[PDB]
Each structure stands twice: as C-alpha cells, then as structure tokens.
Ligand binder design. Structure first.
Ligand SMILES: Cc1cn([C@H]2C[C@H](O)[C@@H](COP(=O)(O)OP(=O)(O)OP(=O)(O)OP(=O)(O)OP(=O)(O)OC[C@H]3O[C@@H](n4cnc5c(N)ncnc54)[C@H](O)[C@@H]3O)O2)c(=O)[nH]c1=O
Ligand SMILES: Cc1cn([C@H]2C[C@H](O)[C@@H](COP(=O)(O)OP(=O)(O)OP(=O)(O)OP(=O)(O)OP(=O)(O)OC[C@H]3O[C@@H](n4cnc5c(N)ncnc54)[C@H](O)[C@@H]3O)O2)c(=O)[nH]c1=O
Lengths: 216, 216
C-alpha cells in the first residue's frame, strides 16, 4: 500500500547531454515531477561554486570547493524528500557521484574516494542512477556554453572518467543494482532518450513504501 | 634549537576569554608569531558563516553550515603550514574541536561526532590544545551582547559543553597527550594567563621528531 515519488538520477561526464535528457524526461513525467540540477547555482553557496567553475581565476582549495559542492546538496535535500513524500517524482542531473568523482580525480593528497564521500554520507540515495557513458573525450560537439568552465579539459575529463568507473564499479559490485551504465557514444538525442526510458519506465511502475529510503 | 614554529590552539565555549587570552599569548610571542581566529569571517565563505551566526533570517541546514565551517579552515591551512615552516609560532582561537562539538551538540540525525569530524580529516593537528573550561555556564550568558549570536543560549551551551567533554575524553584516552584542560572557573585574566603560560612555555622549547606534522 501507499507510495512516494521516485528519485531519478542521471550522471556522466561533461558534454554527454545530461541536461538535455533530463529536460526531456522531466517534460515526459510532468506535471507530477520536479527537475533538479547540481550544482544548484541559485543559492549563495551555489553562487560561489558558479564563480569557481566559470572563472578559473577564482581561488579556492580543492577541499573547500569539494565541501561547498556537498553543502549545496544538503541545503536542498529536505525539499527533495518533501517532494518525494508528496508523491512527486524527481529527475536530477548530477549528485553525490559527480561530487566524489570530480574531486578524487584531482589526486590531491588526502582527497581519496573515501574522504570525498564522507560529507555526502547521510544524503538520500536516488532510486535509480543512470550513468551516461561515452568514449568521446571532451567532445566539442557537446559544449553546454561559452568559453567552457574550469573542469572542461581533455586531460582532467579523462581522469574523472576513470574515477567515475572505479567508484561505480565499487558500489555496484558492492551490491547496488540501481545503477545502470548507458553507452551514449555516437547516439543522437532521440536515440539516447529511447535508451533512457527503457530503463526508467519500469522503475516508475515499481512500488516503493512511502516511508522507505536508502542513504549514502 | 632552531626549527618550525608551534601551532597552539585555545578552545572553549562562548565567553570563556579565548580571544582575550589568545591576544595576550600572541603579544607575548611576537614578533615571530601569528594570531588566527576561526571562523575567519573575512572570506566569502566566512561572510556566509557570519550571517548565519548573526542573522536569524539566514536559513541554512545544519549539515550545510557545518561544512562551510570546515571549508573555512581548508581555505587557510596552506598559510598556517607555510608560516610554521618559516619558523613562526601561531596562536589559534577555535578550530576542529569547535567544529565537531558545536554541530554534534545539535543532536541532528546522522550528525554525530564521527560524521562531524570527517570534513576536517586531513587538517593539521595543533601541537598543543588548551581547553578553557568553566563550571559556571550560567554566568557565561551574562557577558555583554550574549544572546546576539545563534549558539548563544544557556541551554545550547550546556549541550556543547557535554559534547566537548565527550570529544576531548575520546581523543585524550585514545592517546592524544597534546590536549590540556584548563579550569578557568571564576579566575581573572592574569591568573588564567599564568595557567596558560605554564602549559605553553615548555612546548615552545621542545622539538619533537624532526619537526614532523600531525593531522586529523
Ligand atoms: C554536482 C557536482 C558537480 N561537479 C561539477 C561537474 C561539472 O564539471 C561542473 C558543472 O556541472 P554542470 O552539470 O552544471 O555542467 P553544464 O555546464 O551544465 O554541462 P555539462 O558539460 O555537464 O553538459 P550536459 O552534459 O548537461 O549537456 P547538455 O546541456 O545536455 O548539452 C550540451 C549541448 O550538446 C547538445 N547535445 C545533447 N545531446 C546530444 C546528442 N545526443 N548528440 C549531439 N549533441 C547533443 C545539446 O543540445 C547542447 O547543444 O560541476 C563537481 O565537481 N562536483 C559536484 O558535486
Ligand atoms: C571554529 C568554529 C566555530 N563555531 C562556532 C562556535 C561559536 O558559537 C561561533 C562563533 O565563534 P567566535 O569565536 O567567532 O565567537 P566570539 O563571539 O568572537 O567569541 P566568544 O563568545 O567565544 O568569546 P571568547 O570566549 O573568545 O571571549 P573574549 O572575547 O576573550 O571575552 C569576552 C568578555 O569577557 C571578558 N573576559 C575575558 N577573560 C575574562 C576573565 N578571565 N574573567 C572575566 N572577564 C573576562 C573580556 O575582556 C570581554 O569583555 O563559531 C562552529 O560552530 N564551528 C566551527 O568550526
């Protein structure tokens, strides 16, 4: 009996169409759906992350920016949970996985997968996590804007690639099957969209106890 | 002998003469000494923390503000380390213990001593930590301006007290010998100043193992 909305998470490297697919899925699931994107640049903490990403001159240590990315989710997670309990579904672009992967890829002393994950521990786990994977480097043909932000380098993006796999393989081989890797190499928007609904549709029908959640 | 400066930390509840004592100690060790106080409110992250402490309209989740406090130390730690290596002592008012104890005192689900400590893991440990303890938390709430900040209520300071005790007990019993509790109950500035010097002086002269650093 009963039930709550589902939290659908789409993750992946930069320039892999995630915002695109999320808007599609969100439009598809409306009106009983919410859309959320991290970093959520509209809050003060979000603005700081924004400045950091858009201006590679804004100075901030790896650990400080890392914790800001995580506080950005904590400042929003209560609304997320309120929506889910109201039965609404939530499509989310980027979350804890991006948090850990991007920072740990830096290889900064003391900032290993484990350290990077701790600040997010206790946050709601998404009901389904789609990882849009690709073998297409930075991908000029997928730039989501001008000049290109701080992390958009082929070398670094290549680093986050490994870290993303290592982290996911871990939690997968660890017993988590709510994570699906989707190869989107050379796939157009409609195609990738079809591939995603094939995974998401079934989850939306599956029943979840309104009072039951998983956490990081 | 010549070597690296020492990182001296003074901790305690609100209105326990820490600022006072830190300046006194700082003046004592000059010219070769720096004074640092946390939260360091002059940075952007520092500014948000200040607004949180001074403005009840400023809403931020317990986990979020908790991570800002930690990030605020991370944006300064490279300086601390560099100064010490240059041979400068550093007197610091509040640090990681204040971070853990204040947030964990809240009793917020999932925000326990261990969770609270994680973001600070990797940070330089002070060579010496002095905890100014008072038994009269009731008169603490008498000082002028007491109540103007968020954590300034007798009942909450009560909770922070218990938390600080738990946290220092754990660290001391675990084997941290660099932590000293100083009973400052009903003692004046000069007496407390004398009690602090008695502990600090000897440390300034020692030069443990190749001047190596310790970390949280
Ligand atoms: C949450 C979090 C994030 N980050 C970092 C990761 C990032 O480096 C940075 C900004 O992350 P962001 O998600 O705001 O980044 P965006 O600027 O939004 O863009 P991305 O590079 O991730 O873009 P998307 O992957 O969403 O791409 P999208 O906006 O959908 O598309 C870009 C363009 O390509 C086209 N396109 C889309 N799909 C296409 C397809 N199938 N084939 C061809 N072209 C396609 C689109 O129409 C658009 O023109 O934040 C962390 O380091 N830690 C954290 O904790
Ligand atoms: C680092 C960190 C901090 N915090 C939170 C904890 C706090 O609630 C909040 C503000 O922290 P703050 O240190 O910036 O706060 P302040 O308001 O600057 O300082 P306090 O209230 O702690 O005061 P102090 O204890 O330093 O007191 P002091 O300024 O030295 O003295 C106050 C008054 O009493 C007199 N006084 C001083 N010594 C006296 C003595 N021995 N006997 C009697 N009177 C004495 C002084 O002269 C002055 O008038 O930050 C977290 O939650 N997490 C974190 O990670």
């Amino acid at each position: 009996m009963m039930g709550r909305g589902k939290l659908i998470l789409i993750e992946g490297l930069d320039r892999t169409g995630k915002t695109t697919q999320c808007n599609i899925l969100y439009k598809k699931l409306q009106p009983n759906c919410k859309l959320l994107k991290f970093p959520e640049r509209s809050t003060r903490i979000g603005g700081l992350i924004n400045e950091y990403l858009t201006d590679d001159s804004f100075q901030l240590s790896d650990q400080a920016i890392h914790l800001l990315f995580s506080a950005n989710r904590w400042e929003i997670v209560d609304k997320i949970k309120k929506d889910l309990l109201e039965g609404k579904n939530i499509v989310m672009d980027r979350y804890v996985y991006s948090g850990v992967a991007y920072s740990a890829a830096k290889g900064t002393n003391g900032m290993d997968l484990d350290w990077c994950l701790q600040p997010d521990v206790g946050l709601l786990k998404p009901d389904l996590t789609l990882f849009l994977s690709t073998q297409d480097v930075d991908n000029n043909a997928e730039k989501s804007g001008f000049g290109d932000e701080r992390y958009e380098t082929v070398k670094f993006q290549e680093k986050v690639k490994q870290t993303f796999m290592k982290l996911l393989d871990k939690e997968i081989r660890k017993g988590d099957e709510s994570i699906t890797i989707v190869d989107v190499t050379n796939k157009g928007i409609q195609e990738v969209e079809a591939l995603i609904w094939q995974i998401v549709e079934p989850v939306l029908s599956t029943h979840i106890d309104h009072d039951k959640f998983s956490f990081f």
